[PDB]
Design an enzyme around this catalytic site. Structure first.
Site, PDB file in Angstrom:
ATOM      1  N   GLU A  78       0.865  -1.171   0.000  1.00 43.43           N
ATOM      2  CA  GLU A  78       0.000   0.000   0.000  1.00 43.43           C
ATOM      3  C   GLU A  78       0.906   1.226   0.000  1.00 43.43           C
ATOM      4  OE1 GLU A  78      -2.102   0.839   3.662  1.00 43.43           O
ATOM      5  OE2 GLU A  78      -3.979   1.253   2.605  1.00 43.43           O
ATOM      6  N   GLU A 172      -8.194  10.447   2.731  1.00 44.26           N
ATOM      7  CA  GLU A 172      -8.264   9.376   3.711  1.00 44.26           C
ATOM      8  C   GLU A 172      -8.440   9.958   5.096  1.00 44.26           C
ATOM      9  OE1 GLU A 172      -5.140   6.522   3.645  1.00 44.26           O
ATOM     10  OE2 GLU A 172      -5.609   5.716   5.635  1.00 44.26           O
TER      11      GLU A 172
END
Length: 185
Positions: A78, A172
């Site tokens: 990620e 996010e």
């Protein structure tokens, strides 16, 4: 460029009002959330892509990141290129720095344990980070020359997987509230 991917994931906590706007535009209103990731981009990421964006609105009230976001498989990784944040600046194991698109970024690596991944369920995986030393001003046409980051990461032994998943300019958040409006191309 025209975006072809819409990312809208939430672990179900709090309110996450994500709007899939016209073209590469999207907006998000969130409040007392758990973890969530929203953004627009491409179904298949590329290490040669140049991402353009304009955050007309960047107003996190707590922990939130304005960051390029994506995954690779084999191995599962990620990655992030954080241009701005809220009350918390993400950090990890310092590797070095990279100068790109007018800014200086710190390079970090971290590991997630028993956390949700792109494939669903939970597992342990590594995260690659490029975090601007200071917040990038928003409201202007910004560019992220991803190739500069990929090359810098490689020089520090940070190699990405061979199977590329999505790649988006996202918002996010973690246990926070706020608002954002971003246009990607």
């Amino acid at each position: 460029a025209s975006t072809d991917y819409w990312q809208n994931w939430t672990d179900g906590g709090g309110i996450v009002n994500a709007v899939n706007g016209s073209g590469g535009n999207y907006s998000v209103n969130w409040s007392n959330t758990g973890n969530f990731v929203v953004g627009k981009g491409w179904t298949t990421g590329s290490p040669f892509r140049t991402i353009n964006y304009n955050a007309g609105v960047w107003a996190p009230n707590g922990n939130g990141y304005l960051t390029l976001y994506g995954w690779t498989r084999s191995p599962l990784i990620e990655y992030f290129v954080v241009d701005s944040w809220g009350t918390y600046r993400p950090t990890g194991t310092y590797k070095g720095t990279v100068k790109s698109d007018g800014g200086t970024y710190d390079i970090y690596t971290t590991t997630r344990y028993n956390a949700p991944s792109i494939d669903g369920d939970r597992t342990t995986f590594t995260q690659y980070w490029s975090v601007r030393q200071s917040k990038r001003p928003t409201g202007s046409n910004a560019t992220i020359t991803f190739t500069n980051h990929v090359n810098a990461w490689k020089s520090h032994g940070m190699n990405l997987g061979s199977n590329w998943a999505y790649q988006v300019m996202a918002t996010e958040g973690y246990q926070s509230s706020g608002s954002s409006n971003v246009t990607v191309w």
